[PDB]
Enzyme design. Structure first.
Site, PDB file in Angstrom:
ATOM      1  N   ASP A 293     -47.283  -8.697  -2.402  1.00  0.00           N
ATOM      2  CA  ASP A 293     -47.635 -10.046  -1.993  1.00  0.00           C
ATOM      3  C   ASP A 293     -49.020 -10.076  -1.331  1.00  0.00           C
ATOM      4  O   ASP A 293     -49.844 -10.958  -1.618  1.00  0.00           O
ATOM      5  CB  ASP A 293     -46.535 -10.608  -1.061  1.00  0.00           C
ATOM      6  CG  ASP A 293     -45.145 -10.837  -1.768  1.00  0.00           C
ATOM      7  OD1 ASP A 293     -44.137 -10.949  -1.098  1.00  0.00           O
ATOM      8  OD2 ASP A 293     -45.094 -10.922  -3.075  1.00  0.00           O
TER       9      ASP A 293
ATOM     10  N   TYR B   9     -40.747 -16.729  -3.117  1.00  0.00           N
ATOM     11  CA  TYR B   9     -40.618 -16.201  -1.750  1.00  0.00           C
ATOM     12  C   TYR B   9     -41.360 -17.082  -0.755  1.00  0.00           C
ATOM     13  O   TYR B   9     -42.442 -17.564  -1.093  1.00  0.00           O
ATOM     14  CB  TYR B   9     -41.242 -14.784  -1.499  1.00  0.00           C
ATOM     15  CG  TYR B   9     -40.869 -13.711  -2.377  1.00  0.00           C
ATOM     16  CD1 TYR B   9     -41.941 -13.067  -3.021  1.00  0.00           C
ATOM     17  CD2 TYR B   9     -39.546 -13.138  -2.486  1.00  0.00           C
TER      18      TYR B   9
END
Ligand SMILES: [Cu+2]
Ligand code: NA
EC number: 1.4.3.21
Length: 621
Positions: free
Chosen positions: A290, A374
């Protein structure tokens, strides 16, 4: 002018102008990363030089560049063409997120897979997923994304409810080619919806929650000066923001009487990765960095008062660059506030007759980001008593798959036909330490059990052992929860009034580290995640535990290469890298949108002060 101030819109425009004038930012160029660099050691006095580093992609197939510019001086400091097959591809571009679906929509193999499943191509969303490095030699030196399909039954439907298992595709996002379409077999597409605002699924909303009002009638106890300098309850720091890391804290220090005592020079989450544990070839390549591949700061949410940030809130709205070098503000992207934190200290003494109670507070600096399915909140906390803590709040919608007939050892069932593959979310906190200044060292401290015998005849004694980590070759450490293992960062040249070295103790949560086999690609590319604690000698170019260019970079670089230098860390300017993560076996309760779960760490003063630092806290009004 603090050299740690946030980048301003004009600074980003100046970068754009410098690059344009130098011939580095023509119409085929796209900025994949841009951020201010920190001032050099010793720069403080004087003459600032605000430098920005830029990763420049080329949509026409020319080689990308890494450039550093001086916005102060209007110059290019360095510009280097990158060989991406060697040093890695640039971070994913926001513009590439729609490209995977668009290229697949006209590919005959993709259309054949969808037609077999009676899925309307117009309804098929394709998650644009980082590719990693596996066995596909044609991908070396090319910018690839992988795509997994999810059906949206209508435009406001949650596509995550409807994974299309058995199908994956790979795309070259520069040549605009679909390299592979793999269809291993049809799986039912789960039928139920996951629409958490639909009254049919929520039921009648509860009417039982009565309001809670948190207010500060004289405003907050912290001040913000110079855009991003915080003073609060003896703490001093600067709040930075970088498109890759998100919120960064600089110059964390504590005013102890008349001295401003440094504690941490720079604190950040320098990487965060989500490895998946499903051996199906549809997902076995999936590891989402990420931070290093997607850039968490870029996707920071705008945080709404009352809903996202409750109480008396002070916002920062950091500026980043778009893909063309124009400045873009993230409105309300950073929340700052102080809050009550229960009892700080209390004692009711029979002998003296004195009853004493004091309350604690913490300062909170947070942001929230969204990366696909997410969503994560990153929180830094400073407490009255000197404790520093980080917490991540993980939520969003779980990444889904089919739930196999007959079950799975690597996937949880969420709803009929709907699975969620096992995965971890593993963070690396990079703490460039400055305990009472830069001359620091780290000790590993274990509890010591003692045997009943001479000198311990009742068998009650126990003790502690501290082991100094003297060189980087000795500084790759694992947890030992059973022995209460912690790590103390001290300044061996700064003693408290008891003639003992000042320090701070790192308390980890001792959650599992990276579970993948040591020979896997992910164990090589995310080597940092295999051990709980690493200590390096400070070097300005050693920023991320995974190196500069994580996307499609083949293992090795980052912390294991840094450590191999075997530098002296015993009373030197050092950096602690703490790995901590959540191992997520999804539960039914996580569906259709997951309640927050947390992970983090804290540091507590350990002989840093000469006595409690909160004796001057007054009784609660
Ligand atoms: Cu998870
Ligand atoms: Na340091």
């Amino acid at each position: 002018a603090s050299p740690f101030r946030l980048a301003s819109a004009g600074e980003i425009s100046e970068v754009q102008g410098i690059l344009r004038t130098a011939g580095l930012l023509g119409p085929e160029k796209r900025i994949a990363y841009l951020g201010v660099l920190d001032p050099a050691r010793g720069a403080g006095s004087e003459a600032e030089d605000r430098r920005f580093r830029v990763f420049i992609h080329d949509v026409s197939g020319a080689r990308p560049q890494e450039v550093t510019v001086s916005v102060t001086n209007g110059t290019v400091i360095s510009a280097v063409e990158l060989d991406t097959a060697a040093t890695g591809e640039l971070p994913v571009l926001e513009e590439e997120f729609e490209v995977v679906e668009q290229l697949l929509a006209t590919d005959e193999r993709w259309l054949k897979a969808l037609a077999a499943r009676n899925l309307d191509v117009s309804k098929v969303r394709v998650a644009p997923l980082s590719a990693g490095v596996f066995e596909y030699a044609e991908e070396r030196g090319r910018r690839i994304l992988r795509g997994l399909a999810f059906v949206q039954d209508f435009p406001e439907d949650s596509a995550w409810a409807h994974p299309v298992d058995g199908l994956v595709a790979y795309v070259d996002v520069v040549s605009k080619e679909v390299t592979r379409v793999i269809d291993t077999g049809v799986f039912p597409v789960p039928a139920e919806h996951g629409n958490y605002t639909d009254p049919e699924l929520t039921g009648p909303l509860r009417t039982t929650q009565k309001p809670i009002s948190i207010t500060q009638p004289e405003g907050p106890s912290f001040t913000v000066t110079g855009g991003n300098h915080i003073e609060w309850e003896k703490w001093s720091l600067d709040v930075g923001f970088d498109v890759r890391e998100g919120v960064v804290l600089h110059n964390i220090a504590f005013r102890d009487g008349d001295r401003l005592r440094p504690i941490i020079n720079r604190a950040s989450i320098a990487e965060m990765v989500v490895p998946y544990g499903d051996p199906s070839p549809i997902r076995s390549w999936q590891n989402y960095f990420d931070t290093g591949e997607y850039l968490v700061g870029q996707y920071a949410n705008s945080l709404e008062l009352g809903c996202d940030c409750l109480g008396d809130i002070t916002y920062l709205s950091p500026v980043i660059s778009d893909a063309f070098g124009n400045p873009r503000e993230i409105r309300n992207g950073i929340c700052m506030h102080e809050e009550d934190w229960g009892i700080l200290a209390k004692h009711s003494d029979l002998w003296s007759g004195i009853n004493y109670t004091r309350r604690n507070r913490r300062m909170v600096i947070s942001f929230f980001t969204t990366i696909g399915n997410y969503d994560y909140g990153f929180y830094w906390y400073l407490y009255l008593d000197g404790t520093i803590e980080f917490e991540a709040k993980a939520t969003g919608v779980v990444f889904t798959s089919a739930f196999p007939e007959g079950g799975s050892d690597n996937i949880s069932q969420l709803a009929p036909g709907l699975g969620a593959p096992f995965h971890q979310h593993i963070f690396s906190a990079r703490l460039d330490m400055a305990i009472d200044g830069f001359t620091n060292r780290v000790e590993e401290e274990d509890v010591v059990r003692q045997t009943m015998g001479p000198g311990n005849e009742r068998g009650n004694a126990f003790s502690r052992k501290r082991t100094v980590l003297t060189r980087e070759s000795e500084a790759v450490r694992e947890a030992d929860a059973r022995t209460g293992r912690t790590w103390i960062i001290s300044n061996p040249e700064s003693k408290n009034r008891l003639n003992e070295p000042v320090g701070y103790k790192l308390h980890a949560h001792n959650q599992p580290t990276l579970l993948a086999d040591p020979g896997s690609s992910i164990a090589r590319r995310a080597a940092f995640a295999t051990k709980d604690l690493w200590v390096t000698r400070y070097a300005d170019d050693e920023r991320y535990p995974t190196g500069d260019f994580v996307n499609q970079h083949s293992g090795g670089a980052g912390l294991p290469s840094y450590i191999a230098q075997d530098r002296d860390i015993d009373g030197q300017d050092i950096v602690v890298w703490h790995t901590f993560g959540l191992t997520h076996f999804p539960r039914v309760e996580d569906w259709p949108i997951m309640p927050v779960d947390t992970v983090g760490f804290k540091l507590r003063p350990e002989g840093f002060f000469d006595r409690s630092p909160v004796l001057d806290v007054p009784a609660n009004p």
